[PDB]
Enzyme design. Structure first.
Site, PDB file in Angstrom:
ATOM      1  CD  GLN A   1      18.439 -17.690  27.958  1.00  0.00           C
ATOM      2  OE1 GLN A   1      17.226 -17.998  27.580  1.00  0.00           O
ATOM      3  NE2 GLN A   1      19.342 -18.541  27.891  1.00  0.00           N
TER       4      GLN A   1
ATOM      5  CD  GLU B   1      14.048 -21.209  31.566  1.00  0.00           C
ATOM      6  OE1 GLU B   1      14.568 -20.632  30.586  1.00  0.00           O
ATOM      7  OE2 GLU B   1      14.268 -22.402  32.142  1.00  0.00           O
TER       8      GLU B   1
ATOM      9  CB  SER C   1      14.581  -9.281  27.268  1.00  0.00           C
ATOM     10  OG  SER C   1      13.752  -9.476  26.110  1.00  0.00           O
TER      11      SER C   1
ATOM     12  N   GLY D   1       8.788 -12.778  27.678  1.00  0.00           N
ATOM     13  CA  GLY D   1       7.567 -12.845  28.585  1.00  0.00           C
ATOM     14  C   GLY D   1       7.883 -12.385  30.336  1.00  0.00           C
ATOM     15  CB  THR D   2      10.635 -13.581  32.455  1.00  0.00           C
ATOM     16  OG1 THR D   2      10.110 -14.886  32.302  1.00  0.00           O
ATOM     17  CG2 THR D   2      10.870 -13.339  33.821  1.00  0.00           C
TER      18      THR D   2
ATOM     19  CB  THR E   1      15.190 -13.945  19.414  1.00  0.00           C
ATOM     20  OG1 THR E   1      14.228 -13.733  20.301  1.00  0.00           O
ATOM     21  CG2 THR E   1      16.315 -13.499  19.123  1.00  0.00           C
TER      22      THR E   1
ATOM     23  CG  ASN F   1      19.772  -8.291  20.906  1.00  0.00           C
ATOM     24  OD1 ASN F   1      18.884  -8.316  21.065  1.00  0.00           O
ATOM     25  ND2 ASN F   1      21.023  -8.673  21.631  1.00  0.00           N
TER      26      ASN F   1
ATOM     27  CG  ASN G   1      25.199 -10.403  27.695  1.00  0.00           C
ATOM     28  OD1 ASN G   1      24.431  -9.678  26.912  1.00  0.00           O
ATOM     29  ND2 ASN G   1      24.951 -11.595  27.844  1.00  0.00           N
TER      30      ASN G   1
ATOM     31  CD  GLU H   1      26.519  15.777  40.097  1.00  0.00           C
ATOM     32  OE1 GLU H   1      26.706  15.233  41.101  1.00  0.00           O
ATOM     33  OE2 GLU H   1      27.161  16.523  39.712  1.00  0.00           O
TER      34      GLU H   1
HETATM   35  N1  LIG Z   1      22.462  -9.006  24.269  1.00  0.00           N
HETATM   36  C1  LIG Z   1      21.823 -10.191  24.851  1.00  0.00           C
HETATM   37  N2  LIG Z   1      20.656 -10.151  24.231  1.00  0.00           N
HETATM   38  C2  LIG Z   1      19.890 -11.538  24.760  1.00  0.00           C
HETATM   39  C3  LIG Z   1      20.598 -12.325  25.455  1.00  0.00           C
HETATM   40  N3  LIG Z   1      19.602 -13.450  25.949  1.00  0.00           N
HETATM   41  C4  LIG Z   1      18.394 -12.838  25.082  1.00  0.00           C
HETATM   42  N4  LIG Z   1      18.755 -11.769  24.603  1.00  0.00           N
HETATM   43  C5  LIG Z   1      17.502 -10.973  23.916  1.00  0.00           C
HETATM   44  O1  LIG Z   1      16.460 -11.368  24.421  1.00  0.00           O
HETATM   45  C6  LIG Z   1      15.164 -11.089  23.437  1.00  0.00           C
HETATM   46  C7  LIG Z   1      14.025 -11.965  23.795  1.00  0.00           C
HETATM   47  O2  LIG Z   1      13.720 -12.069  25.331  1.00  0.00           O
HETATM   48  P1  LIG Z   1      13.959 -13.540  26.038  1.00  0.00           P
HETATM   49  O3  LIG Z   1      15.308 -14.093  26.020  1.00  0.00           O
HETATM   50  O4  LIG Z   1      13.082 -14.581  25.190  1.00  0.00           O
HETATM   51  O5  LIG Z   1      13.410 -12.934  27.449  1.00  0.00           O
HETATM   52  P2  LIG Z   1      12.952 -13.852  28.434  1.00  0.00           P
HETATM   53  O6  LIG Z   1      12.639 -12.928  29.795  1.00  0.00           O
HETATM   54  O7  LIG Z   1      13.777 -14.833  28.935  1.00  0.00           O
HETATM   55  O8  LIG Z   1      11.534 -14.369  28.087  1.00  0.00           O
HETATM   56  P3  LIG Z   1      10.664 -15.455  28.527  1.00  0.00           P
HETATM   57  O9  LIG Z   1      11.481 -17.033  28.352  1.00  0.00           O
HETATM   58  O10 LIG Z   1       9.426 -15.882  28.006  1.00  0.00           O
HETATM   59  O11 LIG Z   1      10.683 -15.731  29.900  1.00  0.00           O
HETATM   60  C8  LIG Z   1      15.752 -11.404  22.316  1.00  0.00           C
HETATM   61  O12 LIG Z   1      15.589 -10.351  21.352  1.00  0.00           O
HETATM   62  C9  LIG Z   1      17.357 -11.621  22.532  1.00  0.00           C
HETATM   63  O13 LIG Z   1      18.072 -11.239  21.402  1.00  0.00           O
HETATM   64  C10 LIG Z   1      21.754 -12.084  26.010  1.00  0.00           C
HETATM   65  O14 LIG Z   1      22.600 -12.797  26.872  1.00  0.00           O
HETATM   66  N5  LIG Z   1      22.454 -10.862  25.551  1.00  0.00           N
HETATM   67 MG   LIG Z   2      12.639 -16.534  29.619  1.00  0.00          MG
END
Ligand SMILES: Nc1nc2c(ncn2[C@@H]2O[C@H](COP(=O)(O)OP(=O)(O)OP(=O)(O)O)[C@@H](O)[C@H]2O)c(=O)[nH]1
Ligand SMILES: [Mg+2]
Ligand SMILES: CC(=O)O[C@H]1C(=O)[C@@]2(C)[C@H]([C@H](OC(=O)c3ccccc3)[C@]3(O)C[C@H](OC(=O)[C@H](O)[C@@H](NC(=O)c4ccccc4)c4ccccc4)C(C)=C1C3(C)C)[C@]1(OC(C)=O)CO[C@@H]1C[C@@H]2O
Ligand SMILES: CC(=O)O[C@H]1C(=O)[C@@]2(C)[C@H]([C@H](OC(=O)c3ccccc3)[C@]3(O)C[C@H](OC(=O)[C@H](O)[C@@H](NC(=O)c4ccccc4)c4ccccc4)C(C)=C1C3(C)C)[C@]1(OC(C)=O)CO[C@@H]1C[C@@H]2O
Ligand SMILES: Nc1nc2c(ncn2[C@@H]2O[C@H](COP(=O)(O)OP(=O)(O)OP(=O)(O)O)[C@@H](O)[C@H]2O)c(=O)[nH]1
Ligand SMILES: Nc1nc2c(ncn2[C@@H]2O[C@H](COP(=O)(O)OP(=O)(O)O)[C@@H](O)[C@H]2O)c(=O)[nH]1
Ligand SMILES: Nc1nc2c(ncn2[C@@H]2O[C@H](COP(=O)(O)OP(=O)(O)O)[C@@H](O)[C@H]2O)c(=O)[nH]1
Ligand SMILES: [Mg+2]
Lengths: 426, 430, 430, 426
Positions: free
Chosen positions: C11, C64, C133, C137-138, C172, C199, C221, C247
């Protein structure tokens, strides 16, 4: 062009048959007079499959109607579509079968079969290329069970290479009307395992279960049961009557459906079936047709397929639909249910797809199961037979027709041999 | 000069044919009644009669009436000569032995008589284009009966063959592995270049590139015809580097039995995306090396390339193509054999890809068809001979084939001959 | 020439991607349907098809459907190739072992097939830009599965990696420390330069510089994409001192494992203040050395600087930059290591920072991105391995990871390997 | 795409379920006929999570409805949304459970489970990718407690890797309608601790405390209690039905919420809840949603969290809101209340944020607590059980169904083992 000859035996066979002729006449757009009144050229293109052309563009169905009593001929001839059939094709006796297989096979129908078979010749000689015989009967009682299997034997000997395809309503313990039902069926199944190329095993207990647990009918009649049977009869021949994305002849079904020669006791089903008051809430589409079609409540024999494994299933779809979506769902079923299919066949599902769905629905699917669970239908008849036969009960009515006690012993022997061959692949 | 006789067999071959002849009519500007309003570009595919009617150099054959009676009734009823749409009474029932020994045995000497009456209207016939299903009874058994005759009657002439082949998971029949393995003698002994295609690979191409969520067979056949238009385009049109039908084979085929190329087409694209992608020559070249665009479900990275024919058409220049194949030679994931240091045969033709007006596939300035001999295709054979092995260990459907005049030993003799082809494609990679 | 493949995972990576591709489209003048009204400046990020459609050199991957189905439906539905937006059925559940061993194990060979079909369209591919991230998990498990493959398939190519990393207080998930520590093998062994971002640090930058009291992720973002535009600007545009992607690494990375720079951007500013500040080159240089503008919550004054890349863009002159870094060398609070007497790598590019029209961040004549290798970042690791230690002393969530095919010893082997990296960054400061 | 199968057991489970289907049909914009009538594409995008598509674009919910009496099926089928459900999915007996767990588990429901489980198969085989089972029941009485935990055992054995997620209304001393309530619950909790992946513990005493001390309702009915339960049922699945800034599947909840395998007895809550006459005076915003959500009067079990510590809390927010403001408040709570969270977990709060708030409010939060204070719910049932069981009172009604006295001893043993594991982390 792949003509079929259709034959009706006894009360049940003439009743599921006389409803079938109302269903396929609605499909082909034929009036109760025999005149064509349909919308479409596709209705007329293959009308020869089930009918003969006659003068004034009247169509005469290629049925032979067989009974040992006049009263079912009188009930068909006076019925909704009775005037359609050829008067010469009503072949009948006067004194009935007495619910006795040996009267059907040796006495009352052995007299009549010479008058039946010579009409089956007039229809088969009028064919351009006959593909097969489509016989409707019941395995309880004496006319369908004993005369119908005499007639299968005579037509099999005369036409050895044509498809012999039978629709066979057969006994079960909780929905029964005859004391000697187990005897008649065991003597009759002994003929079906050797002669037919396909037999579609149908049960009144399963046809009542569809009427109460799916359609929610308060008072289902035999006319409502005959309507469920005849929908699957129209279903399996569809691909020689209409165009499609995948065409399957009755022989293209048999080559895919029958792994070993004798394992041809199929178990039919149909979709969509909906409660009459609920249709507007349902989405007609391939994955809903699939989730109905492959569920144990939809099949027209008492066997729960969860008590066996399928050898082959054929899903003959009708309607405008995606081949990706059909091929996706027929994959998803046998991978998510893999414990219910034999694992020495690498794909257990045949598919076919016709471009023309039944009048009034956007899609339909006719299901044909071959499954080791059909052992339960032959087992419960064999154990009802055994419990009477150990005390020789009722045998004077059969041995009075000159039948041996040895023929009962040999029929139940051949029944357990059919049970053993399905249980072998379990 | 430069004729091709196209033979469309069974339901798959006839329905691909109904897309091929839909395309060729648009591309040459022939009406569906065979007339042409207002150069000999059509001559490869159409005979011209003195009325100004162009009649296709095609034979349509099916053992049952249903699919060809639809061709005899639809918009193309006036295109074809009525006796080169050929039908029997009896379906082949997905049984090879009905197609080959019992039912097709009756129609064959009528099928040959039409092919003779077409070849006698050619002057330097280039070859045959044979379209069929590997899984069908007519597809396998009748094509193998016909090819055995054409390979004694027309022994010199190139036989190109387009086959819909069984998939990893998608299947329509229980006996599809039996019919396919029994066909492997046909392709090995009586064919010169055999293009295997897969329904499941095109279904995934449709999902990812056309964005159609749920395609029919009309969507597949409109891709399979587009490849044959591109194979034949150098026979039909002007180009910078036109490729002859034997010039093609002299670069594709390294060894006598190693004539099973993959095929792919680029860009497969919808009108939603074709106006935002560049579709430069570099991109549509690179698209042909993605596993995502191969029309057989096997991975080219699990193989080595022996030779590639990049058949470009439309607005391209030899500068751009050389600059493109130089990047393909630079990428270490695209591995050629040590014995093919040249690797690429290039064709370039000035005629853009024709859109079928009802179709999903968008208008574009350029296309390439890449036809590619690679060791990877042996995995599509290793899939299917493992389906065969499970069923033949039980003799699971064998009585239907033995019952229609086949020797039981032909199943062993066909699984044996397939193992010798699967050996040959592993042997040359080294 | 000069391509980059951008891979957006989970995500966070996909949503940063939806800001990256929002920016790159504006900066190159590409419409959200991929077309370009009216130089090859776009070529680093977009393949061009013959229709005049520019298609991004990006892969979007999530286990997902939800976030990529939104990309497939929003304003960019026509930008991307439909098969390089890749989805599974099943969420990774913030469990590393679902991403790496169980669920991502199925999608990986399809993710690689798209990356192969993109690399085969490049000619001198510069590297990979991988967005993810650390806490997901992903994000952790699928990126670590993918990088292990790309590091055998493309071993020479530079892998740049942009990571949203766990904060001091903001979190989170309960299992964010487990997923992050299990990722430390990926960044150490299968990455070449890894940009950690936080964050909570961007939330404080937003509060103090943009004066937005309550930001969303769209505000974060839009800062994280702006840094990657500035890293890539020398690949895309003309400049006085353009910097190549290697470089950059030859000046950032003093030792093979010491490739975790901080990043910062200046001026972060709103339209309320940008018309009253001077935003001279001296001020926006000095802003990069304030603890207030670091995008990881650690203090650079508790470290020593090893090397700084000052990547200027817009209206700047090498006079001004040398005069600026001379004041930074004069300030005793900004301490470099004894072994880096040069300290600064300077890049200067003539293209100003593009405003996203909906955004908070104002139009300005100049920007600098400072990317900075410093010993201070080891405190962001010392925070998180102290969160890990409290939970692993109880085995507090370990049955979810052991239950999905992970070895229990990998938690000890990951905390061990992190302690060896936290050792290396303390060892080189001396 | 992450389908759920939902199952309703006994009077309470069918009543909280039949209200839940009115709530999620309002969200997804589905008419009581089953036809779609909603505003938005997002309502239709994930309608497959809880419904099957059927012909005419009618949607049929993937509920199975289970009871040992016809009268609750009759009350649901005749109700506000009763016509929506599939007639085949109403699976029922005739003679009730008698408020007896052993009738549910061994006699009356052991007969019926073969007819339930084969419908759970038809729905799970129609799924594209099933994520889990969502079962509504009560732990008092005999149908939900004893048949529902029989059915959990059967579905757990058949689907071992899918999420089993239960909403469980359970006994408390000051709001009780059954004498044998303590027995039935103690026999039922013994199945939930082993088989479920999550169990959401709900209490009628806490649901009445929300109705009097928050909503200020003068006469709260069971229909008002069922509305509070079903708001939190809609809440926890939101992130697989709608888009969001942070997505959390039921499995992404479980991995974060369950530290040690058996500590999955959660305690739900919802915000905003306001007195009906007071809404115009309240500011809906994240720090007011927080100051309601984390307060002891809002949780739907009698446990005051001030009698324990939380292990994990999940706050699943819905609406257009700042991630800084959510992450700020979920920090401020567990730092200012640090004595109420376990200090061997470094962050006790999971957050999720959906972009689509419930119809008619600008934001909402569903709260899930895991806390050592849930020991008090299991303790007071265990001490009511003990005071009856020391004198063997009422046991002839259970041992009459062939149950052992040893099974009561073993159930209360396993209950104290669950009390001890929560009290261990206190
Ligand atoms: N800056 C920012 N941080 C994000 C964003 N979406 C998620 N995060 C960060 O993502 C971190 C956790 O990872 P997930 O969002 O659960 O990553 P994921 O790969 O989708 O994890 P899974 O659902 O298990 O597959 C948190 O610490 C959030 O603050 C986004 O659009 N911008
Ligand atoms: Mg995810
Ligand atoms: C507006 C509307 O939706 O009408 C439907 C209808 O309501 C439903 C309930 C119909 C209806 O079926 C029955 O009432 C019925 C009762 C007992 C046994 C079998 C059927 C229908 O009567 C049946 C009828 O089906 C047909 O006409 C088919 O072509 C069928 N032939 C006949 O039923 C038939 C009737 C009289 C004379 C001749 C033929 C058929 C089936 C297979 C192969 C060929 C033809 C249809 C669409 C409907 C009604 C009218 C309500 C259903 O049947 C079919 C075959 O579709 C029962 O479940 C399906 C779902 C339909 O939605
Ligand atoms: C103008 C105005 O502010 O109307 C509100 C309202 O006054 C209040 C008091 C509502 C109202 O709630 C109740 O009256 C109530 C009574 C007993 C038990 C539970 C609720 C409301 O009826 C409830 C209704 O909520 C919904 O419709 C939600 O979408 C909810 N679904 C249903 O309540 C529903 C009702 C009938 C049929 C189908 C669904 C929901 C909750 C969670 C997840 C999905 C949906 C709302 C906003 C209001 C009224 C109408 C007065 C409250 O409820 C909700 C869920 O918002 C009670 O405290 C909140 C605060 C609201 O301000
Ligand atoms: N792409 C595509 N594949 C088709 C089409 N029609 C059939 N197939 C494929 O054909 C294969 C099976 O061969 P059949 O269609 O049964 O071939 P046939 O020659 O008509 O076989 P017989 O009926 O026995 O004579 C299946 O794997 C189908 O997917 C079509 O129009 N397009
Ligand atoms: N479906 C169906 N079943 C019938 C019908 N009439 C009778 N049956 C049932 O099936 C059996 C058929 O036997 P029957 O046809 O009476 O024997 P026959 O006349 O001697 O062949 C009876 O015992 C009934 O249970 C009918 O119209 N439809
Ligand atoms: N929330 C709620 N609680 C109910 C409802 N009906 C009954 N209950 C209560 O919870 C218990 C449920 O037991 P019940 O469902 O009657 O037992 P069963 O039918 O044998 O499963 C009863 O003793 C009531 O106190 C209802 O509609 N809603
Ligand atoms: Mg055929």
């Amino acid at each position: 062009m792949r003509e079929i000859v259709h034959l009706q035996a006894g009360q049940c066979g003439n009743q599921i048959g006389a409803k079938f002729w109302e269903v396929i006449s609605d499909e082909h757009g034929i009036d109760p007079t025999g005149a064509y009144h349909g919308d479409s050229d596709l209705q007329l293109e293959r009308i020869n499959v089930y009918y003969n052309e006659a003068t004034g563009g009247k169509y005469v169905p290629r049925a032979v109607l067989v009974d040992l009593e006049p009263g079912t001929m009188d009930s068909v001839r006076s019925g909704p579509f009775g005037q359609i059939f050829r008067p010469d094709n009503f072949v009948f006796g006067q004194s009935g079968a007495g619910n006795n297989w040996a009267k059907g096979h040796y006495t009352e129908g052995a007299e009549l079969v010479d008058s039946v078979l010579d009409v089956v010749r007039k229809e088969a000689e009028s064919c351009d290329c006959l593909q097969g015989f489509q016989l409707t009967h019941s395995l309880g009682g004496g006319t369908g069970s004993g005369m119908g299997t005499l007639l299968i034997s005579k037509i099999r000997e005369e036409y050895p290479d044509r498809i012999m395809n039978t629709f066979s309503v057969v006994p079960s313990p909780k929905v029964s009307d005859t004391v000697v039902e187990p005897y008649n069926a065991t003597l009759s199944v002994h003929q079906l395992v050797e002669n037919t190329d396909e037999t579609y095993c149908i049960d009144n207990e399963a046809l009542y279960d569809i009427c109460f647990r799916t359609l929610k009918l308060t008072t289902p009649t035999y006319g409502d049961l005959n309507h469920l049977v005849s929908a699957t009869m129209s279903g399996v021949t569809t691909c020689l009557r209409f165009p499609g994305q995948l065409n399957a002849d009755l022989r293209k079904l048999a080559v895919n459906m029958v792994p070993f020669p004798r394992l041809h006791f199929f178990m039919p089903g149909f979709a969509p079936l909906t409660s009459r008051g609920s249709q507007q809430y349902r989405a007609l589409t391939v994955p809903e047709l699939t989730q109905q079609m492959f569920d144990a409540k939809n099949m027209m024999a008492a066997c729960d397929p969860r008590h066996g494994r399928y050898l082959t299933v054929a899903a003959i779809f009708r309607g405008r639909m995606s081949m990706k979506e059909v091929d996706e769902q027929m994959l998803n079923v046998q991978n998510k249910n893999s414990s219910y299919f034999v694992e020495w066949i690498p794909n257990n599902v045949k598919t076919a797809v016709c471009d023309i769905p039944p009048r009034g629905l956007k899609m339909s699917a006719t299901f044909i199961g071959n499954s080791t669970a059909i052992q339960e239908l032959f087992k419960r008849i064999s154990e009802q037979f055994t419990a009477m036969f150990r005390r020789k009960a009722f045998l004077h009515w059969y041995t009075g027709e000159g039948m041996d006690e040895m023929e009962f012993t040999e029929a139940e022997s051949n029944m357990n041999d059919l049970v053993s061959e399905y249980q072998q692949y379990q | 000069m430069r004729e091709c006789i196209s033979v469309h067999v069974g339901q798959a071959g006839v329905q691909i044919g109904n897309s091929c002849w839909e395309l060729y009519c648009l591309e040459h500007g022939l009406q569906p009644d065979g007339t042409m309003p207002s150069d000999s570009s059509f001559g490869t595919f159409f005979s011209e009669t003195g009325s100004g009617k162009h009649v296709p150099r095609a034979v349509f054959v099916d053992l049952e009436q249903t699919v060809i009676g639809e061709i005899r009734n639809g918009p193309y009823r006036s295109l074809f000569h009525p006796e080169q749409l050929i039908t029997g009474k009896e379906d082949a029932a997905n049984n090879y032995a009905r197609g080959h020994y019992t039912i097709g045995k009756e129609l064959i000497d009528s099928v040959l008589d039409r092919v003779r009456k077409m070849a006698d209207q050619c002057s330097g016939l280039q070859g045959f284009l044979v379209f069929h299903s590997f899984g069908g009874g007519t597809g396998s058994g009748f094509t193998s009966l016909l090819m055995e005759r054409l390979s004694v009657d027309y022994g010199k002439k190139s036989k190109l063959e387009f086959s819909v082949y069984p998939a990893p998971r998608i299947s329509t029949a229980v006996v599809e592995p039996y019919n396919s393995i029994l066909t492997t003698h046909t392709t090995l002994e009586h064919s010169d270049c055999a293009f295997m295609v897969d329904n499941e690979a095109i279904y995934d191409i449709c999902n990812r590139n056309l964005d159609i969520e749920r395609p029919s067979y009309t969507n597949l056949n409109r891709l399979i015809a587009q490849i044959v238009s591109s194979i034949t385009a150098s026979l039909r049109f002007d180009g910078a580097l036109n490729v002859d039908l034997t010039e093609f084979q002299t670069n594709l085929v390294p060894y006598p039995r190693i004539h099973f190329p993959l095929v792919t087409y680029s860009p497969i694209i919808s009108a939603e995306k074709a106006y935002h992608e560049q579709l430069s020559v570099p991109e549509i070249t690179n698209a042909c090396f993605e596993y995502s665009n191969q029309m057989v479900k096997c991975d080219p990275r699990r193989g080595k390339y022996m030779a590639c024919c990049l058949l470009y058409r439309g607005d391209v220049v030899p500068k751009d193509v050389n600059a493109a194949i130089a990047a393909i030679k630079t990428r270490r994931s695209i591995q050629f054999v040590d014995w093919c240091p040249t690797g690429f045969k290039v064709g370039i033709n000035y005629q853009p890809p024709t859109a079928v007006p009802g179709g999903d596939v968008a208008k574009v300035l350029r296309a390439v068809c890449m036809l590619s001999n690679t060791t990877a295709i042996a995995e599509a054979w290793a899939r299917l001979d493992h389906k065969f092995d499970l069923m033949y260990s039980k003799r699971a459907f064998v009585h239907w084939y033995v019952g229609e005049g086949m020797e039981e030993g032909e199943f062993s003799e066909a699984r044996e001959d397939m193992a010798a082809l699967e050996k040959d494609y592993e042997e040359v990679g080294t």
